[PDB]
Coordinates of C-alpha atoms in Angstrom, one line a residue:
Chain A
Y1 CA -31.4 -159.9 75.0
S2 CA -31.9 -157.1 72.5
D3 CA -30.8 -153.4 72.0
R4 CA -33.9 -151.8 70.7
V5 CA -36.5 -153.1 73.2
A6 CA -36.3 -151.1 76.4
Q7 CA -38.3 -150.3 79.5
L8 CA -37.9 -147.3 81.8
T9 CA -39.4 -147.5 85.3
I10 CA -39.0 -144.5 87.7
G11 CA -41.2 -144.1 90.7
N12 CA -44.8 -144.9 89.7
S13 CA -44.1 -144.2 86.0
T14 CA -43.2 -146.7 83.3
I15 CA -42.2 -146.2 79.6
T16 CA -42.1 -149.1 77.1
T17 CA -40.7 -149.1 73.6
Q18 CA -40.0 -151.8 71.0
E19 CA -38.3 -149.8 68.3
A20 CA -35.6 -147.7 69.9
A21 CA -31.9 -146.9 69.7
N22 CA -29.5 -147.6 72.7
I23 CA -29.8 -145.3 75.7
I24 CA -27.3 -142.3 75.8
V25 CA -25.8 -141.6 79.2
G26 CA -25.2 -137.9 78.5
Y27 CA -21.5 -137.3 79.1
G28 CA -20.7 -140.9 80.0
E29 CA -21.6 -140.1 83.6
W30 CA -24.6 -141.3 85.6
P31 CA -26.6 -138.7 87.6
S32 CA -25.7 -138.5 91.3
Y33 CA -26.6 -136.8 94.6
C34 CA -24.3 -133.9 95.7
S35 CA -21.3 -134.9 97.9
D36 CA -20.5 -133.2 101.2
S37 CA -17.3 -131.8 99.6
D38 CA -19.0 -130.2 96.5
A39 CA -21.9 -128.7 98.4
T40 CA -21.6 -125.4 100.3
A41 CA -25.0 -124.7 101.8
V42 CA -25.3 -125.9 105.4
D43 CA -29.0 -126.7 105.1
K44 CA -30.1 -130.3 105.2
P45 CA -31.7 -130.7 101.8
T46 CA -35.0 -132.6 101.0
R47 CA -34.7 -135.6 98.7
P48 CA -38.4 -136.4 98.1
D49 CA -37.5 -139.4 95.9
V50 CA -40.4 -141.2 94.3
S51 CA -43.0 -138.3 94.5
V52 CA -40.9 -136.0 92.2
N53 CA -38.6 -138.6 90.5
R54 CA -40.9 -139.9 87.9
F55 CA -41.9 -139.4 84.2
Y56 CA -43.9 -136.3 83.2
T57 CA -45.7 -135.8 79.9
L58 CA -45.7 -132.1 79.3
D59 CA -46.2 -131.5 75.5
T60 CA -47.0 -133.0 72.2
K61 CA -46.1 -131.0 69.0
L62 CA -47.5 -131.9 65.6
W63 CA -44.7 -132.7 63.2
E64 CA -45.9 -131.1 59.9
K65 CA -44.2 -131.6 56.5
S66 CA -42.6 -128.1 56.8
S67 CA -41.6 -127.4 60.4
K68 CA -38.6 -125.5 61.7
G69 CA -38.3 -127.5 65.0
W70 CA -38.9 -126.6 68.6
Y71 CA -37.1 -126.4 71.9
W72 CA -37.7 -126.5 75.7
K73 CA -35.7 -125.0 78.6
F74 CA -35.0 -127.1 81.6
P75 CA -36.0 -127.2 84.3
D76 CA -38.6 -124.4 83.6
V77 CA -40.8 -127.1 81.9
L78 CA -42.0 -128.6 85.2
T79 CA -42.1 -125.6 87.5
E80 CA -45.9 -125.5 87.4
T81 CA -46.3 -129.3 87.0
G82 CA -46.6 -132.0 89.6
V83 CA -45.1 -132.2 93.1
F84 CA -41.6 -131.6 91.6
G85 CA -42.5 -128.0 90.6
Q86 CA -43.9 -127.5 94.1
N87 CA -40.6 -128.2 95.7
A88 CA -38.9 -126.1 93.1
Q89 CA -41.1 -123.1 94.1
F90 CA -41.0 -123.3 97.9
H91 CA -37.2 -123.7 97.7
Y92 CA -34.3 -121.5 96.6
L93 CA -31.8 -124.2 95.8
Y94 CA -32.4 -127.2 93.4
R95 CA -30.4 -130.0 92.0
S96 CA -31.4 -132.8 89.5
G97 CA -30.6 -134.7 86.3
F98 CA -33.2 -135.7 83.8
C99 CA -34.3 -138.8 81.8
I100 CA -35.8 -137.3 78.6
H101 CA -37.8 -139.7 76.4
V102 CA -38.8 -137.9 73.2
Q103 CA -41.2 -140.1 71.2
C104 CA -42.6 -140.1 67.7
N105 CA -43.9 -143.0 65.7
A106 CA -45.2 -143.4 62.1
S107 CA -45.7 -146.2 59.6
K108 CA -43.1 -148.0 57.5
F109 CA -44.3 -145.9 54.5
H110 CA -43.4 -142.7 56.3
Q111 CA -40.0 -141.1 56.1
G112 CA -38.1 -138.4 58.0
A113 CA -35.5 -138.0 60.8
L114 CA -35.7 -135.9 64.0
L115 CA -32.7 -134.7 66.0
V116 CA -33.0 -134.8 69.7
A117 CA -30.3 -132.9 71.5
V118 CA -29.5 -131.7 75.0
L119 CA -27.5 -128.4 74.8
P120 CA -26.4 -127.1 78.2
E121 CA -26.7 -123.3 78.8
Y122 CA -28.7 -122.8 75.6
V123 CA -28.7 -119.0 75.6
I124 CA -31.0 -117.5 72.9
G125 CA -30.3 -114.5 70.8
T126 CA -32.5 -112.2 68.8
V127 CA -32.6 -111.1 65.2
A128 CA -31.0 -107.7 65.7
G129 CA -33.7 -105.7 63.9
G130 CA -33.1 -107.6 60.7
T131 CA -30.1 -105.3 59.9
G132 CA -27.9 -105.9 62.9
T133 CA -28.2 -102.5 64.4
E134 CA -30.4 -103.2 67.4
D135 CA -29.4 -104.7 70.8
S136 CA -32.9 -106.2 71.4
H137 CA -33.4 -109.1 73.8
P138 CA -35.8 -112.0 73.9
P139 CA -39.1 -111.8 75.9
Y140 CA -39.8 -114.1 78.9
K141 CA -42.0 -116.2 76.7
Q142 CA -39.0 -117.0 74.4
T143 CA -36.2 -117.7 76.9
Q144 CA -38.6 -119.5 79.4
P145 CA -41.4 -120.9 77.3
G146 CA -42.2 -123.7 79.8
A147 CA -44.9 -126.2 79.0
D148 CA -45.8 -125.6 75.3
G149 CA -42.2 -124.8 74.3
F150 CA -41.1 -122.4 71.5
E151 CA -40.8 -122.7 67.7
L152 CA -37.4 -121.7 66.3
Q153 CA -37.2 -118.3 64.4
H154 CA -34.5 -119.8 62.2
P155 CA -33.3 -123.4 62.6
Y156 CA -30.0 -123.3 60.7
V157 CA -28.6 -120.7 63.1
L158 CA -29.8 -122.0 66.5
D159 CA -31.2 -118.6 67.4
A160 CA -27.8 -117.8 69.0
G161 CA -25.3 -117.5 66.1
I162 CA -24.2 -121.1 66.6
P163 CA -24.8 -123.7 63.8
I164 CA -27.1 -126.7 64.1
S165 CA -24.6 -128.2 61.6
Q166 CA -22.6 -129.3 64.6
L167 CA -25.2 -129.8 67.4
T168 CA -24.4 -133.6 67.6
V169 CA -21.5 -132.6 69.9
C170 CA -23.5 -132.4 73.1
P171 CA -25.5 -135.6 74.0
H172 CA -27.9 -136.3 71.1
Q173 CA -30.0 -139.1 69.6
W174 CA -31.7 -139.2 66.2
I175 CA -35.3 -140.3 65.6
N176 CA -35.1 -141.8 62.1
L177 CA -38.6 -143.0 61.2
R178 CA -37.4 -146.1 59.3
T179 CA -35.4 -147.5 62.3
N180 CA -36.4 -146.0 65.6
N181 CA -39.5 -144.4 67.0
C182 CA -38.2 -142.8 70.2
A183 CA -35.0 -141.2 71.7
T184 CA -33.8 -141.4 75.3
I185 CA -31.3 -139.0 76.9
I186 CA -30.0 -139.3 80.5
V187 CA -28.2 -136.2 81.7
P188 CA -26.6 -135.5 85.1
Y189 CA -26.8 -132.2 86.9
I190 CA -24.7 -130.0 84.5
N191 CA -23.6 -126.8 86.3
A192 CA -20.6 -125.1 87.8
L193 CA -22.6 -124.8 91.0
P194 CA -23.8 -127.6 93.4
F195 CA -27.2 -126.0 93.4
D196 CA -29.1 -123.3 91.6
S197 CA -32.5 -121.4 91.5
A198 CA -34.3 -123.6 89.0
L199 CA -36.5 -120.6 88.3
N200 CA -33.9 -118.0 87.2
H201 CA -31.3 -120.4 85.8
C202 CA -31.9 -123.1 83.2
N203 CA -29.3 -125.9 83.2
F204 CA -29.9 -126.9 79.6
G205 CA -32.2 -126.9 76.6
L206 CA -33.9 -129.8 74.7
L207 CA -33.7 -129.2 70.9
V208 CA -36.2 -131.3 68.9
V209 CA -35.6 -130.4 65.3
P210 CA -36.1 -132.3 62.0
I211 CA -33.2 -132.3 59.5
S212 CA -34.7 -134.7 56.9
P213 CA -38.3 -133.5 56.4
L214 CA -41.3 -135.7 57.2
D215 CA -42.9 -137.0 54.0
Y216 CA -45.7 -139.4 53.1
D217 CA -48.0 -140.2 50.1
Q218 CA -51.8 -139.7 50.2
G219 CA -52.1 -142.4 52.9
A220 CA -54.5 -142.7 55.8
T221 CA -52.5 -140.7 58.4
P222 CA -51.2 -137.1 58.0
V223 CA -51.2 -136.3 61.8
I224 CA -47.8 -137.3 63.2
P225 CA -47.2 -136.0 66.7
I226 CA -43.9 -135.7 68.7
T227 CA -44.4 -136.1 72.4
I228 CA -42.0 -135.0 75.1
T229 CA -41.5 -136.9 78.4
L230 CA -39.0 -136.3 81.2
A231 CA -38.1 -137.5 84.7
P232 CA -36.0 -135.8 87.4
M233 CA -33.3 -138.0 88.9
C234 CA -31.6 -137.6 92.3
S235 CA -33.6 -134.5 93.1
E236 CA -32.5 -132.2 95.9
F237 CA -34.0 -129.0 97.3
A238 CA -32.6 -126.6 99.9
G239 CA -33.3 -123.1 101.2
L240 CA -36.9 -123.3 102.2
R241 CA -39.2 -120.2 101.9
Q242 CA -42.6 -119.2 100.6
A243 CA -44.0 -120.2 97.3
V244 CA -42.4 -118.1 94.5
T245 CA -43.0 -118.3 90.7
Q246 CA -41.9 -116.7 87.5
Chain B
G1 CA 7.5 -118.9 161.8
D2 CA 10.5 -117.9 159.7
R3 CA 10.0 -116.3 157.5
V4 CA 6.5 -114.8 157.6
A5 CA 3.9 -116.8 155.7
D6 CA 2.1 -114.0 153.9
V7 CA 5.4 -113.5 152.0
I8 CA 6.1 -117.2 151.3
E9 CA 2.7 -117.9 149.7
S10 CA 2.3 -114.3 148.2
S11 CA 2.0 -114.3 144.5
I12 CA 3.7 -110.9 144.2
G13 CA 5.9 -110.8 141.2
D14 CA 4.2 -113.4 139.2
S15 CA 5.7 -112.9 135.8
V16 CA 3.8 -114.9 133.2
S17 CA 0.5 -113.5 131.9
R18 CA -2.1 -116.1 132.8
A19 CA -3.7 -117.2 129.4
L20 CA -7.5 -117.7 129.5
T21 CA -7.3 -118.9 125.9
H22 CA -4.9 -120.5 123.5
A23 CA -4.8 -120.3 119.7
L24 CA -5.8 -123.2 117.4
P25 CA -5.0 -123.7 113.8
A26 CA -7.6 -122.7 111.2
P27 CA -6.2 -123.3 107.7
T28 CA -9.7 -124.0 106.3
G29 CA -13.1 -122.6 107.3
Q30 CA -14.8 -124.7 110.0
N31 CA -16.5 -127.8 108.6
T32 CA -20.2 -128.5 109.4
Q33 CA -21.3 -131.7 111.1
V34 CA -24.7 -133.2 110.4
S35 CA -27.6 -132.3 112.6
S36 CA -31.0 -133.8 113.5
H37 CA -34.1 -132.7 115.3
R38 CA -34.0 -132.2 119.1
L39 CA -37.0 -131.8 121.4
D40 CA -35.6 -131.6 124.9
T41 CA -35.9 -129.5 128.2
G42 CA -32.7 -127.9 129.6
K43 CA -30.6 -128.0 126.4
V44 CA -31.2 -124.6 125.0
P45 CA -28.5 -123.0 122.8
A46 CA -30.5 -120.2 121.2
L47 CA -31.2 -118.5 124.5
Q48 CA -28.2 -116.3 125.6
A49 CA -27.4 -113.2 127.6
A50 CA -25.7 -110.4 125.7

């Protein structure tokens, strides 16, 4: 038995890792299907299981020596991907937790540390005209970037007035290049409602941001990519209609 | 006979208002039982006469 060697099998997907930290269970609470006492919709939901509950590789950013960090908004990342997104479009109501496996590996002569974090209801603010006298709002491509994700305007402030200096409150996991090469976060369905639109509302936001900068000598590898992988758990859909998008 | 029968049987003067319906307790909204598919002839809830 060991702590750093792990394997994650969901549906027909499988992730292996030999240099990891222990798995974080979000808020000390495993993802679950919705009870008959929490639910309110009378429709009999579809629980497609294997077809949608599986790992998805959606993006791969290049961690350069001077990067501000990126973020993704869930579950807008999958809405056009796979047979999960198909159910999320034909339906009004959706419910699921995720199994995020951020991954980034380098040599032993590289250094740097990422900060993987899952911040629920990550509302994004705008630079108010530089001076503070403009009630502007972010475009659709900033609040719902989707596949490619979005680069932070400023990383210190989390583009919302809140400090990254205390982001390790909500479920997080560091990727420190000298110890681990991947992070794994399991979150349950975090919402005040038993179901939600999945298109309009975004349950949380994945914040992949470096705090200690990537550095390396004149070695033989300067291209160090971070890759994002996720997998819906206990997925439920209700309120069937026509195919609707963004 | 004595007395006349159409007075003996007669329901004239029946006091209590005959109730066609009684009231049931409803503290909570009605719960919803689980349902499955049904493909039958004769059992037809949707069809009604207003």
